[PDB]
PDB file of C-alpha atoms in Angstrom:
ATOM      1  CA  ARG A 186     103.027 229.893  67.025  1.00  0.00           C
ATOM      2  CA  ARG A 187     104.590 229.276  70.473  1.00  0.00           C
ATOM      3  CA  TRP A 188     103.154 225.744  70.645  1.00  0.00           C
ATOM      4  CA  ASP A 189     106.476 223.833  70.476  1.00  0.00           C
ATOM      5  CA  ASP A 190     108.969 225.536  72.806  1.00  0.00           C
ATOM      6  CA  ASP A 191     110.608 222.703  74.781  1.00  0.00           C
ATOM      7  CA  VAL A 192     111.050 220.501  71.685  1.00  0.00           C
ATOM      8  CA  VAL A 193     114.640 219.235  71.620  1.00  0.00           C
ATOM      9  CA  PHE A 194     114.636 217.743  68.114  1.00  0.00           C
ATOM     10  CA  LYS A 195     113.133 220.395  65.839  1.00  0.00           C
ATOM     11  CA  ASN A 196     112.691 218.562  62.525  1.00  0.00           C
ATOM     12  CA  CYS A 197     114.338 215.481  61.035  1.00  0.00           C
ATOM     13  CA  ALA A 198     112.964 215.713  57.441  1.00  0.00           C
ATOM     14  CA  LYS A 199     114.869 212.575  56.384  1.00  0.00           C
ATOM     15  CA  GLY A 200     113.323 209.107  56.399  1.00  0.00           C
ATOM     16  CA  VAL A 201     116.053 206.997  54.807  1.00  0.00           C
ATOM     17  CA  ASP A 202     118.663 209.868  54.548  1.00  0.00           C
ATOM     18  CA  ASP A 203     119.547 208.920  50.929  1.00  0.00           C
ATOM     19  CA  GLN A 204     116.224 208.801  49.039  1.00  0.00           C
ATOM     20  CA  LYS A 205     112.502 208.406  49.640  1.00  0.00           C
ATOM     21  CA  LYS A 206     112.864 204.605  49.531  1.00  0.00           C
ATOM     22  CA  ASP A 207     115.347 201.943  48.443  1.00  0.00           C
ATOM     23  CA  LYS A 208     114.420 201.762  44.707  1.00  0.00           C
ATOM     24  CA  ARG A 209     117.420 199.515  43.975  1.00  0.00           C
ATOM     25  CA  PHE A 210     117.553 195.736  43.633  1.00  0.00           C
ATOM     26  CA  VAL A 211     120.536 193.583  44.584  1.00  0.00           C
ATOM     27  CA  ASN A 212     121.423 189.946  43.986  1.00  0.00           C
ATOM     28  CA  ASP A 213     122.031 189.412  47.720  1.00  0.00           C
ATOM     29  CA  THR A 214     118.787 187.872  48.969  1.00  0.00           C
ATOM     30  CA  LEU A 215     119.565 188.606  52.624  1.00  0.00           C
ATOM     31  CA  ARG A 216     120.481 192.269  52.047  1.00  0.00           C
ATOM     32  CA  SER A 217     117.418 193.142  49.973  1.00  0.00           C
ATOM     33  CA  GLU A 218     113.981 194.659  50.491  1.00  0.00           C
ATOM     34  CA  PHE A 219     112.335 191.227  50.719  1.00  0.00           C
ATOM     35  CA  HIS A 220     114.344 189.894  53.665  1.00  0.00           C
ATOM     36  CA  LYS A 221     114.279 193.296  55.372  1.00  0.00           C
ATOM     37  CA  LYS A 222     110.476 193.284  55.457  1.00  0.00           C
ATOM     38  CA  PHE A 223     110.183 189.588  56.343  1.00  0.00           C
ATOM     39  CA  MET A 224     112.495 190.116  59.328  1.00  0.00           C
ATOM     40  CA  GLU A 225     110.548 193.209  60.427  1.00  0.00           C
ATOM     41  CA  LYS A 226     106.905 192.178  59.914  1.00  0.00           C
ATOM     42  CA  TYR A 227     106.749 188.449  60.684  1.00  0.00           C
ATOM     43  CA  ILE A 228     109.518 188.709  63.283  1.00  0.00           C
ATOM     44  CA  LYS A 229     109.532 190.999  66.318  1.00  0.00           C
TER      45      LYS A 229
ATOM     46  CA  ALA B 294     128.816 217.052  79.472  1.00  0.00           C
ATOM     47  CA  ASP B 295     129.370 214.963  82.609  1.00  0.00           C
ATOM     48  CA  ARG B 296     131.922 217.430  83.983  1.00  0.00           C
ATOM     49  CA  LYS B 297     129.741 220.370  82.941  1.00  0.00           C
ATOM     50  CA  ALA B 298     126.547 219.057  84.547  1.00  0.00           C
ATOM     51  CA  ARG B 299     128.379 218.178  87.771  1.00  0.00           C
ATOM     52  CA  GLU B 300     129.406 221.814  88.209  1.00  0.00           C
ATOM     53  CA  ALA B 301     126.007 223.069  87.026  1.00  0.00           C
ATOM     54  CA  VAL B 302     124.016 220.998  89.519  1.00  0.00           C
ATOM     55  CA  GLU B 303     126.443 222.007  92.277  1.00  0.00           C
ATOM     56  CA  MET B 304     125.950 225.710  91.548  1.00  0.00           C
ATOM     57  CA  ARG B 305     122.194 225.137  91.309  1.00  0.00           C
ATOM     58  CA  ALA B 306     122.232 223.491  94.735  1.00  0.00           C
ATOM     59  CA  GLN B 307     124.376 226.290  96.186  1.00  0.00           C
ATOM     60  CA  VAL B 308     121.851 228.896  95.038  1.00  0.00           C
ATOM     61  CA  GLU B 309     119.161 226.616  96.458  1.00  0.00           C
ATOM     62  CA  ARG B 310     121.104 226.368  99.724  1.00  0.00           C
ATOM     63  CA  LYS B 311     121.360 230.161  99.667  1.00  0.00           C
ATOM     64  CA  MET B 312     117.591 230.187  99.172  1.00  0.00           C
ATOM     65  CA  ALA B 313     117.227 227.627 101.968  1.00  0.00           C
ATOM     66  CA  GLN B 314     119.346 229.715 104.344  1.00  0.00           C
ATOM     67  CA  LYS B 315     117.435 232.889 103.460  1.00  0.00           C
ATOM     68  CA  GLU B 316     114.022 231.266 103.928  1.00  0.00           C
ATOM     69  CA  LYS B 317     115.029 229.753 107.275  1.00  0.00           C
ATOM     70  CA  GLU B 318     116.419 233.057 108.568  1.00  0.00           C
ATOM     71  CA  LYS B 319     113.268 234.983 107.637  1.00  0.00           C
ATOM     72  CA  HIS B 320     110.989 232.396 109.255  1.00  0.00           C
ATOM     73  CA  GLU B 321     113.054 232.357 112.456  1.00  0.00           C
ATOM     74  CA  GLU B 322     112.976 236.154 112.753  1.00  0.00           C
ATOM     75  CA  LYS B 323     109.196 236.363 112.294  1.00  0.00           C
ATOM     76  CA  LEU B 324     108.491 233.569 114.792  1.00  0.00           C
ATOM     77  CA  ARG B 325     110.799 234.911 117.516  1.00  0.00           C
ATOM     78  CA  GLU B 326     110.068 238.654 117.233  1.00  0.00           C
ATOM     79  CA  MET B 327     106.307 238.402 117.634  1.00  0.00           C
ATOM     80  CA  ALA B 328     104.073 241.436 117.179  1.00  0.00           C
ATOM     81  CA  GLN B 329     101.968 240.655 120.272  1.00  0.00           C
ATOM     82  CA  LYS B 330     102.727 238.611 123.426  1.00  0.00           C
ATOM     83  CA  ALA B 331     106.227 237.479 122.484  1.00  0.00           C
ATOM     84  CA  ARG B 332     107.715 236.744 125.915  1.00  0.00           C
ATOM     85  CA  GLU B 333     105.681 238.851 128.375  1.00  0.00           C
ATOM     86  CA  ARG B 334     103.085 236.127 129.016  1.00  0.00           C
TER      87      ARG B 334
ATOM     88  CA  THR C 780     115.684 181.716  63.767  1.00  0.00           C
ATOM     89  CA  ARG C 781     118.674 181.454  61.429  1.00  0.00           C
ATOM     90  CA  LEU C 782     117.582 184.591  59.573  1.00  0.00           C
ATOM     91  CA  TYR C 783     116.956 186.546  62.781  1.00  0.00           C
ATOM     92  CA  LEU C 784     120.372 185.600  64.165  1.00  0.00           C
ATOM     93  CA  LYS C 785     122.200 186.390  60.919  1.00  0.00           C
ATOM     94  CA  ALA C 786     120.545 189.797  60.532  1.00  0.00           C
ATOM     95  CA  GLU C 787     121.424 190.688  64.122  1.00  0.00           C
ATOM     96  CA  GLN C 788     125.007 189.520  63.566  1.00  0.00           C
ATOM     97  CA  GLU C 789     125.432 191.739  60.505  1.00  0.00           C
ATOM     98  CA  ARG C 790     123.836 194.701  62.287  1.00  0.00           C
ATOM     99  CA  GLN C 791     126.049 194.357  65.367  1.00  0.00           C
ATOM    100  CA  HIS C 792     129.127 194.036  63.151  1.00  0.00           C
ATOM    101  CA  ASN C 793     128.037 197.171  61.292  1.00  0.00           C
ATOM    102  CA  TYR C 794     127.666 199.067  64.576  1.00  0.00           C
ATOM    103  CA  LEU C 795     131.327 198.469  65.445  1.00  0.00           C
ATOM    104  CA  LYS C 796     132.806 198.848  61.952  1.00  0.00           C
ATOM    105  CA  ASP C 797     130.619 201.680  60.688  1.00  0.00           C
ATOM    106  CA  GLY C 798     129.204 204.431  62.866  1.00  0.00           C
ATOM    107  CA  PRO C 799     125.347 204.275  63.142  1.00  0.00           C
ATOM    108  CA  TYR C 800     125.504 206.227  66.399  1.00  0.00           C
ATOM    109  CA  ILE C 801     122.877 208.076  68.437  1.00  0.00           C
ATOM    110  CA  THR C 802     123.549 211.494  66.810  1.00  0.00           C
ATOM    111  CA  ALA C 803     126.178 212.661  69.334  1.00  0.00           C
ATOM    112  CA  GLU C 804     125.388 216.369  68.912  1.00  0.00           C
ATOM    113  CA  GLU C 805     121.762 215.758  69.898  1.00  0.00           C
ATOM    114  CA  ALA C 806     122.785 213.050  72.378  1.00  0.00           C
ATOM    115  CA  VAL C 807     124.291 215.708  74.650  1.00  0.00           C
ATOM    116  CA  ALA C 808     120.881 217.394  74.622  1.00  0.00           C
ATOM    117  CA  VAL C 809     119.151 214.163  75.666  1.00  0.00           C
ATOM    118  CA  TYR C 810     121.544 213.746  78.594  1.00  0.00           C
ATOM    119  CA  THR C 811     120.903 217.386  79.498  1.00  0.00           C
ATOM    120  CA  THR C 812     117.135 216.889  79.204  1.00  0.00           C
ATOM    121  CA  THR C 813     117.122 214.046  81.735  1.00  0.00           C
ATOM    122  CA  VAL C 814     119.459 216.022  84.002  1.00  0.00           C
ATOM    123  CA  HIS C 815     117.101 219.002  83.882  1.00  0.00           C
ATOM    124  CA  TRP C 816     113.946 216.918  84.361  1.00  0.00           C
ATOM    125  CA  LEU C 817     115.362 215.104  87.391  1.00  0.00           C
ATOM    126  CA  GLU C 818     116.529 218.396  88.905  1.00  0.00           C
ATOM    127  CA  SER C 819     113.108 219.966  88.323  1.00  0.00           C
ATOM    128  CA  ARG C 820     111.399 217.011  89.996  1.00  0.00           C
ATOM    129  CA  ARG C 821     114.197 217.041  92.649  1.00  0.00           C
ATOM    130  CA  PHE C 822     114.184 213.230  92.760  1.00  0.00           C
ATOM    131  CA  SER C 823     116.907 211.635  94.862  1.00  0.00           C
ATOM    132  CA  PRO C 824     119.037 209.066  93.005  1.00  0.00           C
ATOM    133  CA  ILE C 825     118.865 205.339  93.713  1.00  0.00           C
ATOM    134  CA  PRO C 826     121.185 204.538  96.640  1.00  0.00           C
ATOM    135  CA  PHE C 827     123.877 201.891  96.774  1.00  0.00           C
TER     136      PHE C 827
END
């Protein structure tokens, strides 16, 4: 109580805004979960 | 928001300039009209 | 390097075609937050 007063953004409550994760495979190898993680972890 | 904040900071400076004019007038009246040995010495 | 350039090319093309913006309702609050923080600190702006 009264610990977050000047907080502009109150609560997002949405990580991916459609589901908890992807949970859907696609034949496009570039637009998939494998190339999305390999371009985010190994690359910077 | 750019037109709104331009008028808001101008009105905030005008109240600050009103505070600056009031603080300068009170300090000039207390320094001139001294309670003891103003201009007799 | 080919995968990093192709993923940036598809993301920049998606930013113009689609609208992954900066949440324009809250973006007016972020511009007001920096305007209030600079006025509270009374910092002069960078001159020409």
